[PDB]
């Protein structure tokens, strides 16, 4: 299974990475996320974590 259903740490990560790039490009984002894929990336942000 995955890193468990998301952690503080990883959101952390997902909160830095669209900062620089933005609310986009989730396979570049999933490419440092190793682990998750481009739907996890999408929906974990597309939910709660949309401050943009």
């Given at each position: 299974?995955?890193?468990g259903?998301?952690?503080k740490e990883e959101?952390?990560?997902?909160?830095e990475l669209?900062?620089?790039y933005g609310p986009k490009?989730?396979?570049v984002?999933?490419?440092?996320?190793?682990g998750r894929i481009g739907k996890q990336?999408?929906?974990r942000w597309h939910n709660h974590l949309n401050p943009e």
């Open positions: 299974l995955i890193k259903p998301w952690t959101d952390q990560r997902v909160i669209v900062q620089k490009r989730w396979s984002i999933a490419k440092h996320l190793k990336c999408r929906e």
